[PDB]
């Protein structure tokens, strides 16, 4: 609800005046627009020069913006869209003449814009680098040591994305030429052919890898099955030998004891 | 092929030829025969027991107990004549 920055502090005002001045001078503000920049001007400014500074800064944040005929009537909306964290602390009536008693709120607003501009440039630089990095992710992942299908089946969608990015490059460039009344796209087509050859090579490696794995699984299954059958032979060989051997023991004992019983019952005197 | 035409049936046939009841029934008859030998030997074995001739087949000797002491000499069953020899010892040491 309130601005936490010490806007009234004269040391703070002296500091941010330097920081605003330094950035504007370094980035050719006083040259791109004929208005010169000075610590004194930021000490107490003119309304005309303030709008020049605000417009110059915001265009560095939003270059396509079309300023209206009376910039004072859209500064509040611009800050609302910018999501200025100290919007509530600034009343729409004082934007008309900022050089008055409330100038500290607008000096602080200008400093925040300078800091946003500085930070936005770093953000966009990181975004640029990310785009370059994302253009190679697939060929980098797809050319890693290949794993079995049980842990990479989304591989197909990675291939399709790589080919789609090639076509996106082709048609994006061709369309630029088309809007320039140009009709020859052979440069872009030759570029697409070369990138597509990369795709063919890497997936050709997958075909050969998978083919070799398939012919080798055949050998491995043949060996495993033979070993398993030998295991079955062993079970049958000694199960049968077990049963027949005990059958022999049972048979011998019964004839043994039968002969004993005959002797016990042979009461012939002779 | 050095393989099995049908390993599943092969094993199944062995199990179906693994007659359990036949061997169990055999054991019943063997146990029955032991009871028959025991019961039909009992009366004779006690008459021979009252003679004092007690028998160890755990340890390869024969005992004689017709002198009111356990000091009567034993006879091994191996390397002996028995031509009026084993019978003679087990009749001359007997009251």
């Amino acid at each position: 609800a309130r601005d936490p920055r010490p806007l009234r502090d004269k040391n703070f005002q002296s500091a941010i005046q330097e920081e605003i001045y330094d950035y504007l001078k370094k980035n050719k503000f006083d040259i791109e627009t004929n208005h010169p920049i000075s610590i004194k001007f930021l000490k107490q400014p003119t309304q005309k020069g303030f709008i020049i500074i605000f417009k110059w800064l915001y265009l560095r944040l939003d270059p396509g913006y079309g300023f209206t005929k009376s910039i004072e009537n859209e500064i509040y909306q611009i800050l609302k869209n910018l999501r200025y964290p100290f919007l509530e602390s600034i009343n729409k009536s004082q934007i008309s003449a900022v050089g008055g008693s409330n100038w500290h709120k607008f000096l602080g607003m200008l400093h925040w814009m300078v800091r946003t501009n500085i930070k936005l440039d770093m953000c966009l630089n990181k975004v640029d680098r990310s785009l370059i990095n994302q253009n190679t992710q697939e060929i980098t992942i797809l050319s890693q040591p290949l794993k079995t299908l049980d842990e990479q089946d989304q591989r197909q969608e990675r291939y399709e994305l790589m080919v789609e990015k090639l076509l996106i490059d082709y048609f994006t460039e061709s369309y630029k030429s088309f809007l320039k009344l140009e009709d020859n796209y052979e440069p872009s087509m030759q570029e697409l052919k070369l990138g597509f050859e990369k795709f063919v090579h890497i997936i050709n490696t997958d075909v050969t890898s998978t083919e070799l794995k398939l012919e080798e699984l055949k050998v491995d299954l043949n060996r495993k099955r033979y070993k398993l059958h030998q295991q079955v032979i062993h079970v049958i060989d000694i199960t049968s030998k077990f049963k027949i051997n005990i059958q022999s023991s049972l048979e011998n004992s019964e004839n043994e004891l039968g002969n004993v019983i005959e002797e016990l019952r042979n009461l012939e005197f002779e | 092929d050095n393989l099995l035409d049908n390993p599943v049936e092969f094993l199944k046939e062995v199990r179906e030829s693994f007659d359990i009841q036949q061997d169990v029934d055999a054991m019943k008859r063997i146990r029955h025969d032991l009871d028959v030998i025991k019961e039909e030997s009992e009366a004779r074995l006690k008459l021979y027991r009252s003679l004092g001739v007690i028998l160890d087949l755990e340890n390869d000797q024969v005992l004689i107990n017709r002198k009111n002491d356990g000091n009567i000499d034993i006879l091994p069953l191996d390397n002996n004549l028995s031509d009026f020899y084993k019978t003679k010892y087990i009749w001359e040491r007997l009251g």
Binding site: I233, D237, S240, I244 | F10, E13, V14, S17, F18, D19
Partner: peptide
């Protein structure tokens, strides 16, 4: 070539079956 172990094992199976189906007494 000489994988006749199967016949050797099947000979045992056939012996066991013949013992199970055997009827002791037989006349004429």
């Amino acid at each position: 070539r000489a994988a006749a172990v199967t016949s050797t094992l099947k000979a045992r199976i056939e012996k066991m079956k013949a013992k199970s189906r055997r009827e002791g007494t037989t006349r004429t």
